[PDB]
Amino acid sequence: NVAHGLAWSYYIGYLRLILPELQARIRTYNQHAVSQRLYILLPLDCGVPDNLSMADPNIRFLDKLPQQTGDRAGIKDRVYSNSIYELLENGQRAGTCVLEYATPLQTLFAMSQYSQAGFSREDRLEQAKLFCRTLEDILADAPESQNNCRLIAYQESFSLSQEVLRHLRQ
Amino acid sequence: NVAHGLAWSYYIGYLRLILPELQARIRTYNQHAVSQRLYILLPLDCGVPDNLSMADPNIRFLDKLPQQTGDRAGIKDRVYSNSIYELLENGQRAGTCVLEYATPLQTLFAMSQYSQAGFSREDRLEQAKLFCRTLEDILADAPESQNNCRLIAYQESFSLSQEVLRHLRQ
Ligand SMILES: Nc1nc2c(ncn2[C@@H]2O[C@@H]3COP(=O)(O)O[C@H]4[C@@H](F)[C@H](n5cnc6c(N)ncnc65)O[C@@H]4COP(=O)(O)O[C@H]3[C@H]2F)c(=O)[nH]1
């Protein structure tokens, strides 16, 4: 059940705030092409490396988008920032996108290690699936998600660069 | 049960990252006095205004701390920023601190309005209490919380500026 609140946290505190202003943020960057969707990686093993290039050398960080900021819960100018990556394939620039892991999967993996969290390591995968399932339902019936992001869930030769390219080509 | 994952999310994804580097961040600001603890507001009604001055005119935003940034889940240079407030009392500067609401309480209040979230409005208060109770337990046995933050839970004439001052004077 923990994954449930995390998916809803993931949407209320993020997806529903940056998704509406995301097209305008890519358009700016293009007119100093980055594709217009926010690609979200959901590894079901919940292994979420912080540096995306260490998961695959064919994913190269290129730049940051223009920051988005707002006052939130008493923090003046809270900062939402997103990175642009190029996807390479046989030495060729095959695509460019705003690409990133779903952070809460890291929370699930950290909750598993702490004994005080009452969350067993065996349950990581079932909660990862529940997290994806719930988030896909939240986005299916959401105004914010008007074709703004694509969830990339996968299980682990294996190329993830290829995985992103698969959905990117679609 | 949703509050449980939120408290653990609140710690793994925030408290345990900024708390260790918080003393060093205040010390910098002092040597261009801000008190050395991170004061976290937990309204049990889960009403979390974004601008802290609209909850009480005696809380005046003063400045931002030096930002803290790191690579996280594929975002290059993710930004953690915190605001410094002065607490006034009969026109007098009575205190200065890094003060802020616990954001997840906003998630609880948003989850209550959405029917798809399976979270009734009657349960807001019980989950707010469960959120505070869990977070107080996580911090009690935490290395990060070596006298770094004070939880300010309250229920609602009433002065909150006075509330913060109470714990501040201690
Ligand atoms: N004042 C303050 N508080 C913070 C901060 N960072 C974390 N917190 C606290 O910790 C909770 C869990 O953080 P998380 O583990 O990163 O999970 C996040 C993440 F998955 C995504 N997200 C949000 N901003 C993003 C960004 N900028 N990039 C990527 N992703 C993001 O939405 C979740 C919930 O976001 P919420 O805010 O609703 O709840 C948060 C909040 F209470 C911070 O900079 N300043």
Side-chain angles (χ1 to χ4, degrees), chain A residues 6 9-15 18 72-75 78-82 100-107 131, chain B residues 6 8-15 17-18 68 72-73 75 78-82 100-107 131:
Chain A
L6 295 184
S9 165
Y10 191 58
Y11 165 72
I12 292 169
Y14 190 51
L15 279 194
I18 75 165
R72 273 213 79 214
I75 292 81
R78 186 174 161 173
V79 173
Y80 303 92
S81 155
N82 309 75
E100 77 185 54
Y101 281 103
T103 320
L105 284 179
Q106 261 194 10
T107 298
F131 177 88
Chain B
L6 295 184
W8 275 95
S9 165
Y10 191 58
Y11 165 72
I12 292 169
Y14 190 51
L15 279 194
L17 312 180
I18 75 165
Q68 155 181 19
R72 273 213 79 214
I75 292 81
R78 186 174 161 173
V79 173
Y80 303 92
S81 155
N82 309 75
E100 77 185 54
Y101 281 103
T103 320
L105 284 179
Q106 261 194 10
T107 298
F131 177 88

Short mmCIF file of all heavy atoms in Angstrom, two decimals, chain A residues 6 9-15 18 72-75 78-82 100-107 131, chain B residues 6 8-15 17-18 68 72-73 75 78-82 100-107 131, ligand 1:
data_model
loop_
_atom_site.label_atom_id
_atom_site.label_comp_id
_atom_site.label_asym_id
_atom_site.label_seq_id
_atom_site.Cartn_x
_atom_site.Cartn_y
_atom_site.Cartn_z
N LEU A 6 2.77 7.12 -2.72
CA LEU A 6 3.93 7.65 -3.44
C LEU A 6 3.54 8.08 -4.85
O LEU A 6 3.96 9.15 -5.31
CB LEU A 6 5.05 6.62 -3.47
CG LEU A 6 5.63 6.27 -2.11
CD1 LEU A 6 6.81 5.32 -2.24
CD2 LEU A 6 6.06 7.53 -1.36
N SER A 9 1.66 11.18 -4.31
CA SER A 9 2.65 12.21 -4.01
C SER A 9 3.39 12.63 -5.26
O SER A 9 3.62 13.83 -5.49
CB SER A 9 3.63 11.71 -2.96
OG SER A 9 4.78 12.55 -2.90
N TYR A 10 3.76 11.66 -6.10
CA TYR A 10 4.50 11.94 -7.32
C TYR A 10 3.72 12.84 -8.26
O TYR A 10 4.33 13.61 -9.02
CB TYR A 10 4.86 10.62 -8.03
CG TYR A 10 5.86 10.77 -9.16
CD1 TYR A 10 7.12 11.31 -8.94
CD2 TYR A 10 5.54 10.36 -10.45
CE1 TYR A 10 8.03 11.44 -9.97
CE2 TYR A 10 6.45 10.49 -11.48
CZ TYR A 10 7.69 11.03 -11.24
OH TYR A 10 8.59 11.16 -12.27
N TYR A 11 2.40 12.78 -8.23
CA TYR A 11 1.56 13.56 -9.14
C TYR A 11 1.20 14.92 -8.55
O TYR A 11 1.38 15.95 -9.21
CB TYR A 11 0.29 12.77 -9.47
CG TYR A 11 -0.81 13.60 -10.12
CD1 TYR A 11 -0.69 14.04 -11.43
CD2 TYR A 11 -1.96 13.93 -9.41
CE1 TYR A 11 -1.68 14.79 -12.01
CE2 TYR A 11 -2.95 14.68 -9.99
CZ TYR A 11 -2.81 15.11 -11.29
OH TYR A 11 -3.80 15.86 -11.88
N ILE A 12 0.70 14.93 -7.31
CA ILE A 12 0.27 16.18 -6.68
C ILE A 12 1.45 17.13 -6.52
O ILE A 12 1.32 18.34 -6.73
CB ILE A 12 -0.41 15.90 -5.34
CG1 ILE A 12 -1.74 15.18 -5.56
CG2 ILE A 12 -0.61 17.19 -4.54
CD1 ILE A 12 -2.36 14.62 -4.30
N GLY A 13 2.61 16.61 -6.14
CA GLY A 13 3.76 17.44 -5.87
C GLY A 13 4.73 17.62 -7.01
O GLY A 13 5.81 18.17 -6.79
N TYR A 14 4.39 17.20 -8.23
CA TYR A 14 5.35 17.26 -9.32
C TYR A 14 4.68 17.20 -10.69
O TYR A 14 4.54 18.23 -11.36
CB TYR A 14 6.37 16.12 -9.18
CG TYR A 14 7.54 16.24 -10.13
CD1 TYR A 14 8.27 17.42 -10.22
CD2 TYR A 14 7.93 15.16 -10.92
CE1 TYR A 14 9.35 17.52 -11.08
CE2 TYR A 14 9.00 15.26 -11.77
CZ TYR A 14 9.71 16.44 -11.85
OH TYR A 14 10.78 16.54 -12.71
N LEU A 15 4.25 16.01 -11.10
CA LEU A 15 3.74 15.82 -12.46
C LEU A 15 2.68 16.87 -12.80
O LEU A 15 2.72 17.46 -13.89
CB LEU A 15 3.16 14.41 -12.60
CG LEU A 15 4.17 13.29 -12.86
CD1 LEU A 15 3.47 12.03 -13.32
CD2 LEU A 15 5.21 13.72 -13.88
N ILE A 18 4.66 20.54 -13.14
CA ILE A 18 5.61 20.82 -14.22
C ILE A 18 5.05 20.44 -15.59
O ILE A 18 5.34 21.12 -16.58
CB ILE A 18 6.96 20.13 -13.95
CG1 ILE A 18 6.88 18.62 -14.22
CG2 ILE A 18 7.42 20.40 -12.52
CD1 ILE A 18 8.24 17.96 -14.33
N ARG A 72 6.21 27.38 -2.47
CA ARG A 72 5.55 26.12 -2.15
C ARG A 72 5.77 25.76 -0.68
O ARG A 72 6.91 25.51 -0.27
CB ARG A 72 6.03 25.02 -3.10
CG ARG A 72 5.20 25.01 -4.37
CD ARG A 72 5.04 23.63 -4.91
NE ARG A 72 4.01 22.91 -4.17
CZ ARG A 72 4.04 21.61 -3.92
NH1 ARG A 72 5.05 20.84 -4.33
NH2 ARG A 72 3.04 21.08 -3.23
N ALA A 73 4.69 25.76 0.12
CA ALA A 73 4.77 25.34 1.53
C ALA A 73 5.77 26.18 2.33
O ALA A 73 6.42 25.71 3.27
CB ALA A 73 5.12 23.85 1.64
N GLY A 74 5.89 27.45 1.96
CA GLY A 74 6.72 28.38 2.68
C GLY A 74 8.14 28.49 2.19
O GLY A 74 8.93 29.21 2.81
N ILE A 75 8.50 27.81 1.11
CA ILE A 75 9.81 27.99 0.49
C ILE A 75 9.66 29.00 -0.63
O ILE A 75 8.95 28.76 -1.61
CB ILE A 75 10.37 26.66 -0.04
CG1 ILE A 75 10.71 25.72 1.12
CG2 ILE A 75 11.60 26.93 -0.90
CD1 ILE A 75 9.52 24.97 1.66
N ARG A 78 10.89 27.81 -4.90
CA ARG A 78 11.32 26.42 -4.99
C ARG A 78 11.56 26.06 -6.46
O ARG A 78 10.83 26.51 -7.35
CB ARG A 78 10.28 25.48 -4.38
CG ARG A 78 10.73 24.03 -4.32
CD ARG A 78 9.76 23.11 -3.58
NE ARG A 78 10.02 21.72 -3.94
CZ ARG A 78 9.43 20.66 -3.37
NH1 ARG A 78 8.56 20.83 -2.39
NH2 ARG A 78 9.74 19.44 -3.78
N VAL A 79 12.58 25.25 -6.71
CA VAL A 79 13.16 25.10 -8.04
C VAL A 79 12.90 23.70 -8.57
O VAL A 79 13.33 22.70 -7.97
CB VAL A 79 14.66 25.41 -8.04
CG1 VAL A 79 15.26 25.07 -9.40
CG2 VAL A 79 14.89 26.87 -7.71
N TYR A 80 12.21 23.62 -9.71
CA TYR A 80 11.99 22.39 -10.46
C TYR A 80 12.82 22.46 -11.73
O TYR A 80 12.56 23.31 -12.59
CB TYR A 80 10.51 22.23 -10.79
CG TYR A 80 9.64 22.25 -9.57
CD1 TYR A 80 9.08 23.43 -9.11
CD2 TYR A 80 9.38 21.08 -8.86
CE1 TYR A 80 8.29 23.46 -7.98
CE2 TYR A 80 8.59 21.10 -7.73
CZ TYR A 80 8.04 22.28 -7.30
OH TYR A 80 7.25 22.29 -6.17
N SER A 81 13.80 21.56 -11.85
CA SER A 81 14.72 21.56 -12.98
C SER A 81 14.77 20.16 -13.60
O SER A 81 14.65 19.15 -12.90
CB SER A 81 16.12 22.01 -12.56
OG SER A 81 17.11 21.49 -13.44
N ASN A 82 14.97 20.12 -14.92
CA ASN A 82 14.94 18.88 -15.69
C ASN A 82 16.06 18.88 -16.72
O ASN A 82 16.36 19.91 -17.32
CB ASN A 82 13.59 18.70 -16.39
CG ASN A 82 12.41 18.87 -15.45
OD1 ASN A 82 12.06 19.99 -15.06
ND2 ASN A 82 11.79 17.76 -15.09
N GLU A 100 14.27 11.10 -17.31
CA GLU A 100 14.57 11.04 -15.89
C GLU A 100 13.89 9.85 -15.24
O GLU A 100 12.86 9.36 -15.72
CB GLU A 100 14.13 12.33 -15.18
CG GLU A 100 12.64 12.41 -14.94
CD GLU A 100 12.21 13.74 -14.36
OE1 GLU A 100 12.53 14.79 -14.96
OE2 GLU A 100 11.56 13.75 -13.29
N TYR A 101 14.48 9.40 -14.13
CA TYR A 101 13.91 8.34 -13.31
C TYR A 101 12.78 8.90 -12.44
O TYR A 101 12.78 10.07 -12.06
CB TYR A 101 14.96 7.72 -12.40
CG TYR A 101 15.87 6.71 -13.06
CD1 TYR A 101 17.17 7.04 -13.41
CD2 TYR A 101 15.44 5.41 -13.30
CE1 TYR A 101 17.99 6.12 -13.99
CE2 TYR A 101 16.27 4.48 -13.89
CZ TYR A 101 17.55 4.85 -14.24
OH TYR A 101 18.39 3.94 -14.83
N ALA A 102 11.82 8.03 -12.12
CA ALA A 102 10.82 8.37 -11.12
C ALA A 102 11.45 8.26 -9.74
O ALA A 102 11.68 7.16 -9.25
CB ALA A 102 9.61 7.46 -11.25
N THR A 103 11.72 9.41 -9.12
CA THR A 103 12.41 9.44 -7.84
C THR A 103 11.81 8.52 -6.79
O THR A 103 12.57 7.80 -6.12
CB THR A 103 12.44 10.89 -7.34
OG1 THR A 103 12.70 11.76 -8.45
CG2 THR A 103 13.52 11.08 -6.29
N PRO A 104 10.49 8.50 -6.58
CA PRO A 104 9.93 7.68 -5.49
C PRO A 104 10.37 6.22 -5.51
O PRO A 104 10.37 5.59 -4.45
CB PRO A 104 8.41 7.81 -5.71
CG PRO A 104 8.26 9.18 -6.32
CD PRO A 104 9.45 9.32 -7.24
N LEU A 105 10.72 5.66 -6.67
CA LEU A 105 11.24 4.30 -6.67
C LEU A 105 12.49 4.19 -5.82
O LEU A 105 12.74 3.14 -5.22
CB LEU A 105 11.52 3.84 -8.10
CG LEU A 105 10.28 3.48 -8.94
CD1 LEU A 105 10.68 3.06 -10.35
CD2 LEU A 105 9.46 2.39 -8.25
N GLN A 106 13.28 5.26 -5.75
CA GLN A 106 14.39 5.31 -4.80
C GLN A 106 13.89 5.27 -3.36
O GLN A 106 14.51 4.63 -2.50
CB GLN A 106 15.22 6.57 -5.03
CG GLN A 106 16.47 6.37 -5.85
CD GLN A 106 17.40 7.57 -5.74
OE1 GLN A 106 17.19 8.45 -4.91
NE2 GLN A 106 18.42 7.61 -6.59
N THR A 107 12.79 5.97 -3.07
CA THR A 107 12.22 5.92 -1.73
C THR A 107 11.80 4.50 -1.37
O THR A 107 12.04 4.04 -0.25
CB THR A 107 11.03 6.88 -1.62
OG1 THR A 107 11.48 8.23 -1.83
CG2 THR A 107 10.40 6.78 -0.25
N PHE A 131 3.21 0.91 -7.94
CA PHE A 131 3.50 2.32 -8.18
C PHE A 131 3.25 2.68 -9.63
O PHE A 131 2.64 3.71 -9.93
CB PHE A 131 4.94 2.64 -7.79
CG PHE A 131 5.32 4.07 -8.07
CD1 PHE A 131 5.11 5.06 -7.12
CD2 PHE A 131 5.89 4.42 -9.28
CE1 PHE A 131 5.45 6.38 -7.39
CE2 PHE A 131 6.23 5.74 -9.55
CZ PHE A 131 6.01 6.72 -8.60
N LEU B 6 4.53 8.67 3.40
CA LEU B 6 4.85 10.08 3.20
C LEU B 6 5.92 10.54 4.19
O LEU B 6 6.85 11.26 3.80
CB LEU B 6 3.59 10.93 3.32
CG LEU B 6 2.54 10.66 2.24
CD1 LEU B 6 1.37 11.61 2.38
CD2 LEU B 6 3.15 10.77 0.86
N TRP B 8 8.17 8.61 5.54
CA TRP B 8 9.41 8.00 5.08
C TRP B 8 9.91 8.65 3.80
O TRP B 8 11.12 8.82 3.61
CB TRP B 8 9.22 6.49 4.90
CG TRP B 8 9.42 5.77 6.19
CD1 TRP B 8 8.45 5.40 7.08
CD2 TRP B 8 10.67 5.39 6.78
NE1 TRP B 8 9.02 4.79 8.17
CE2 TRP B 8 10.38 4.77 8.01
CE3 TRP B 8 12.00 5.51 6.38
CZ2 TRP B 8 11.38 4.27 8.85
CZ3 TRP B 8 13.00 5.00 7.21
CH2 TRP B 8 12.68 4.39 8.43
N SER B 9 8.99 9.04 2.91
CA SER B 9 9.39 9.83 1.74
C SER B 9 9.97 11.16 2.17
O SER B 9 10.99 11.61 1.62
CB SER B 9 8.19 10.05 0.82
OG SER B 9 8.46 11.08 -0.12
N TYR B 10 9.35 11.80 3.16
CA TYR B 10 9.80 13.10 3.64
C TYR B 10 11.22 13.04 4.18
O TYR B 10 11.95 14.04 4.11
CB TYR B 10 8.85 13.62 4.73
CG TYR B 10 9.06 15.08 5.10
CD1 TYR B 10 8.96 16.08 4.15
CD2 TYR B 10 9.33 15.44 6.42
CE1 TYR B 10 9.15 17.41 4.50
CE2 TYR B 10 9.52 16.76 6.76
CZ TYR B 10 9.43 17.74 5.80
OH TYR B 10 9.62 19.05 6.15
N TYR B 11 11.63 11.90 4.72
CA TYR B 11 12.96 11.76 5.33
C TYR B 11 14.00 11.31 4.31
O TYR B 11 15.06 11.92 4.19
CB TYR B 11 12.89 10.77 6.50
CG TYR B 11 14.24 10.28 6.98
CD1 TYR B 11 15.09 11.12 7.69
CD2 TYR B 11 14.65 8.98 6.73
CE1 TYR B 11 16.31 10.68 8.13
CE2 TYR B 11 15.88 8.53 7.17
CZ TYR B 11 16.70 9.39 7.87
OH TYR B 11 17.93 8.94 8.31
N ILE B 12 13.70 10.24 3.57
CA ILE B 12 14.66 9.69 2.61
C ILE B 12 14.97 10.70 1.52
O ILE B 12 16.12 10.84 1.09
CB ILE B 12 14.13 8.37 2.02
CG1 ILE B 12 14.10 7.28 3.09
CG2 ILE B 12 14.98 7.93 0.82
CD1 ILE B 12 13.35 6.04 2.68
N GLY B 13 13.95 11.42 1.05
CA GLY B 13 14.13 12.34 -0.04
C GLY B 13 14.39 13.78 0.33
O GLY B 13 14.37 14.65 -0.55
N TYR B 14 14.64 14.08 1.61
CA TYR B 14 14.77 15.48 2.01
C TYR B 14 15.51 15.62 3.34
O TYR B 14 16.69 15.98 3.36
CB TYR B 14 13.39 16.13 2.10
CG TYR B 14 13.43 17.63 2.29
CD1 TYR B 14 14.20 18.43 1.45
CD2 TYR B 14 12.70 18.25 3.29
CE1 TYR B 14 14.24 19.80 1.61
CE2 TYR B 14 12.74 19.61 3.46
CZ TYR B 14 13.51 20.39 2.62
OH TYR B 14 13.54 21.75 2.79
N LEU B 15 14.82 15.34 4.45
CA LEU B 15 15.39 15.60 5.77
C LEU B 15 16.79 15.01 5.90
O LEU B 15 17.71 15.68 6.39
CB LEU B 15 14.47 15.02 6.85
CG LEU B 15 13.26 15.88 7.23
CD1 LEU B 15 12.63 15.38 8.52
CD2 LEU B 15 13.65 17.34 7.36
N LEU B 17 18.92 14.42 3.60
CA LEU B 17 19.88 15.02 2.68
C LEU B 17 20.27 16.44 3.05
O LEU B 17 21.45 16.79 2.98
CB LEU B 17 19.34 15.02 1.24
CG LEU B 17 18.72 13.75 0.66
CD1 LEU B 17 18.29 14.03 -0.75
CD2 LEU B 17 19.71 12.61 0.67
N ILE B 18 19.31 17.28 3.44
CA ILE B 18 19.63 18.68 3.73
C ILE B 18 20.06 18.88 5.18
O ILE B 18 20.91 19.73 5.46
CB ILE B 18 18.45 19.59 3.36
CG1 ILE B 18 17.31 19.49 4.38
CG2 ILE B 18 17.94 19.27 1.95
CD1 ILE B 18 16.31 20.62 4.27
N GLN B 68 21.51 24.26 -2.03
CA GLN B 68 22.22 22.99 -2.03
C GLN B 68 21.76 22.21 -3.26
O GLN B 68 20.56 22.16 -3.54
CB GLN B 68 21.94 22.20 -0.74
CG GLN B 68 22.10 20.69 -0.87
CD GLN B 68 21.79 19.97 0.44
OE1 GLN B 68 21.14 20.51 1.32
NE2 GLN B 68 22.28 18.74 0.55
N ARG B 72 20.27 13.77 -8.80
CA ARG B 72 19.32 12.89 -8.11
C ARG B 72 18.36 12.27 -9.12
O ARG B 72 17.57 12.98 -9.75
CB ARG B 72 18.60 13.67 -7.01
CG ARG B 72 19.40 13.64 -5.72
CD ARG B 72 18.50 13.63 -4.53
NE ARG B 72 17.98 12.29 -4.30
CZ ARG B 72 16.77 12.03 -3.82
NH1 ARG B 72 15.92 13.01 -3.51
NH2 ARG B 72 16.41 10.77 -3.66
N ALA B 73 18.43 10.94 -9.29
CA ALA B 73 17.48 10.22 -10.16
C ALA B 73 17.51 10.74 -11.60
O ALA B 73 16.51 10.74 -12.32
CB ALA B 73 16.06 10.28 -9.60
N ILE B 75 18.39 13.87 -12.63
CA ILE B 75 18.30 15.31 -12.78
C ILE B 75 19.66 15.89 -12.41
O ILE B 75 20.10 15.79 -11.26
CB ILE B 75 17.19 15.92 -11.91
CG1 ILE B 75 15.82 15.49 -12.41
CG2 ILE B 75 17.31 17.43 -11.89
CD1 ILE B 75 15.40 14.11 -11.96
N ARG B 78 19.90 19.04 -9.06
CA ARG B 78 18.61 19.29 -8.42
C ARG B 78 18.80 20.22 -7.23
O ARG B 78 19.80 20.13 -6.51
CB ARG B 78 17.96 17.98 -7.98
CG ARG B 78 16.54 18.17 -7.44
CD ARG B 78 15.83 16.85 -7.13
NE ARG B 78 14.70 17.10 -6.23
CZ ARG B 78 13.80 16.19 -5.87
NH1 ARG B 78 13.87 14.95 -6.35
NH2 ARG B 78 12.82 16.52 -5.04
N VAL B 79 17.85 21.12 -7.02
CA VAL B 79 18.05 22.29 -6.17
C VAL B 79 17.16 22.18 -4.93
O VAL B 79 15.93 22.12 -5.03
CB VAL B 79 17.76 23.59 -6.93
CG1 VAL B 79 17.80 24.77 -5.96
CG2 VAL B 79 18.77 23.78 -8.04
N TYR B 80 17.80 22.19 -3.76
CA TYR B 80 17.15 22.26 -2.46
C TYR B 80 17.41 23.64 -1.87
O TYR B 80 18.56 23.97 -1.57
CB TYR B 80 17.67 21.17 -1.54
CG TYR B 80 17.52 19.80 -2.13
CD1 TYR B 80 18.54 19.22 -2.87
CD2 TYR B 80 16.35 19.07 -1.94
CE1 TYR B 80 18.40 17.97 -3.42
CE2 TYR B 80 16.20 17.81 -2.48
CZ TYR B 80 17.23 17.26 -3.22
OH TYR B 80 17.07 16.00 -3.75
N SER B 81 16.34 24.42 -1.70
CA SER B 81 16.45 25.79 -1.21
C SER B 81 15.50 26.00 -0.03
O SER B 81 14.42 25.42 0.02
CB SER B 81 16.16 26.81 -2.32
OG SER B 81 15.72 28.04 -1.78
N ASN B 82 15.92 26.86 0.90
CA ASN B 82 15.19 27.09 2.14
C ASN B 82 15.19 28.58 2.47
O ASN B 82 16.20 29.26 2.27
CB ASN B 82 15.81 26.31 3.30
CG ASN B 82 16.00 24.84 2.98
OD1 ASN B 82 16.92 24.47 2.24
ND2 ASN B 82 15.15 23.99 3.54
N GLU B 100 9.52 26.48 7.72
CA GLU B 100 8.80 25.98 6.56
C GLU B 100 7.78 24.93 6.97
O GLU B 100 7.93 24.26 7.99
CB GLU B 100 9.76 25.39 5.52
CG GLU B 100 10.27 24.01 5.89
CD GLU B 100 11.32 23.50 4.92
OE1 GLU B 100 12.33 24.21 4.71
OE2 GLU B 100 11.14 22.39 4.38
N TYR B 101 6.74 24.80 6.14
CA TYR B 101 5.74 23.76 6.30
C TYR B 101 6.27 22.42 5.80
O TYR B 101 7.11 22.35 4.90
CB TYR B 101 4.46 24.10 5.52
CG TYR B 101 3.55 25.09 6.19
CD1 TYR B 101 3.50 26.41 5.77
CD2 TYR B 101 2.70 24.70 7.23
CE1 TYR B 101 2.66 27.31 6.36
CE2 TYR B 101 1.85 25.61 7.83
CZ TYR B 101 1.84 26.91 7.39
OH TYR B 101 1.00 27.83 7.98
N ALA B 102 5.76 21.34 6.40
CA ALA B 102 6.01 20.01 5.87
C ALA B 102 5.14 19.81 4.64
O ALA B 102 3.93 19.61 4.75
CB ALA B 102 5.73 18.95 6.92
N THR B 103 5.76 19.84 3.46
CA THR B 103 5.03 19.75 2.20
C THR B 103 4.06 18.59 2.13
O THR B 103 2.91 18.80 1.71
CB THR B 103 6.05 19.68 1.05
OG1 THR B 103 7.13 20.58 1.33
CG2 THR B 103 5.40 20.06 -0.26
N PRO B 104 4.44 17.36 2.51
CA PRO B 104 3.52 16.22 2.35
C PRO B 104 2.13 16.44 2.95
O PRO B 104 1.18 15.80 2.49
CB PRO B 104 4.26 15.07 3.05
CG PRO B 104 5.72 15.42 2.85
CD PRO B 104 5.76 16.93 2.99
N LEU B 105 2.00 17.28 3.98
CA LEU B 105 0.66 17.56 4.49
C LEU B 105 -0.23 18.15 3.41
O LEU B 105 -1.44 17.93 3.41
CB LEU B 105 0.74 18.49 5.70
CG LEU B 105 1.22 17.85 7.00
CD1 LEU B 105 1.28 18.87 8.13
CD2 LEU B 105 0.33 16.67 7.39
N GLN B 106 0.36 18.90 2.48
CA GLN B 106 -0.37 19.34 1.30
C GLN B 106 -0.80 18.16 0.44
O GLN B 106 -1.91 18.16 -0.12
CB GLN B 106 0.48 20.31 0.48
CG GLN B 106 0.18 21.77 0.70
CD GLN B 106 0.81 22.64 -0.37
OE1 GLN B 106 1.30 22.12 -1.38
NE2 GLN B 106 0.81 23.95 -0.16
N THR B 107 0.08 17.17 0.29
CA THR B 107 -0.29 15.97 -0.47
C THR B 107 -1.48 15.27 0.17
O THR B 107 -2.40 14.82 -0.53
CB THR B 107 0.91 15.03 -0.59
OG1 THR B 107 1.97 15.67 -1.31
CG2 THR B 107 0.51 13.76 -1.31
N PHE B 131 1.22 11.06 10.41
CA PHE B 131 2.39 11.59 9.74
C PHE B 131 3.37 12.19 10.74
O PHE B 131 4.58 11.95 10.67
CB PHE B 131 1.99 12.64 8.71
CG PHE B 131 3.16 13.28 8.01
CD1 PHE B 131 3.71 12.71 6.87
CD2 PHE B 131 3.74 14.43 8.52
CE1 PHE B 131 4.80 13.29 6.23
CE2 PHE B 131 4.83 15.02 7.89
CZ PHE B 131 5.36 14.44 6.75
N1 LIG C 1 11.05 22.36 0.79
C1 LIG C 1 11.55 21.24 -0.05
N2 LIG C 1 11.10 19.98 0.21
C2 LIG C 1 11.53 18.92 -0.53
C3 LIG C 1 12.49 19.16 -1.62
N3 LIG C 1 12.74 17.96 -2.17
C4 LIG C 1 12.01 17.03 -1.51
N4 LIG C 1 11.29 17.60 -0.53
C5 LIG C 1 10.37 16.91 0.40
O1 LIG C 1 10.44 15.47 0.33
C6 LIG C 1 9.30 14.91 -0.38
C7 LIG C 1 9.71 13.74 -1.25
O2 LIG C 1 10.73 14.13 -2.13
P1 LIG C 1 11.09 13.08 -3.28
O3 LIG C 1 11.66 11.85 -2.66
O4 LIG C 1 12.08 13.78 -4.18
O5 LIG C 1 9.76 12.64 -4.08
C8 LIG C 1 9.30 13.70 -4.89
C9 LIG C 1 9.72 13.54 -6.35
F1 LIG C 1 9.46 12.25 -6.73
C10 LIG C 1 8.81 14.51 -7.11
N5 LIG C 1 9.47 15.84 -7.19
C11 LIG C 1 9.12 16.95 -6.52
N6 LIG C 1 9.95 17.98 -6.84
C12 LIG C 1 10.85 17.52 -7.73
C13 LIG C 1 12.00 18.08 -8.48
N7 LIG C 1 12.36 19.37 -8.33
N8 LIG C 1 12.67 17.25 -9.32
C14 LIG C 1 12.32 15.96 -9.49
N9 LIG C 1 11.28 15.40 -8.84
C15 LIG C 1 10.52 16.11 -7.96
O6 LIG C 1 7.60 14.50 -6.34
C16 LIG C 1 7.78 13.86 -5.05
C17 LIG C 1 7.01 14.57 -3.94
O7 LIG C 1 7.37 15.93 -3.90
P2 LIG C 1 6.81 16.73 -2.63
O8 LIG C 1 7.39 18.11 -2.72
O9 LIG C 1 5.31 16.74 -2.69
O10 LIG C 1 7.21 15.99 -1.25
C18 LIG C 1 8.59 16.11 -1.02
C19 LIG C 1 8.93 17.20 0.00
F2 LIG C 1 8.08 17.06 1.06
C20 LIG C 1 12.93 20.56 -1.83
O11 LIG C 1 13.74 20.84 -2.74
N10 LIG C 1 12.43 21.51 -1.04
#
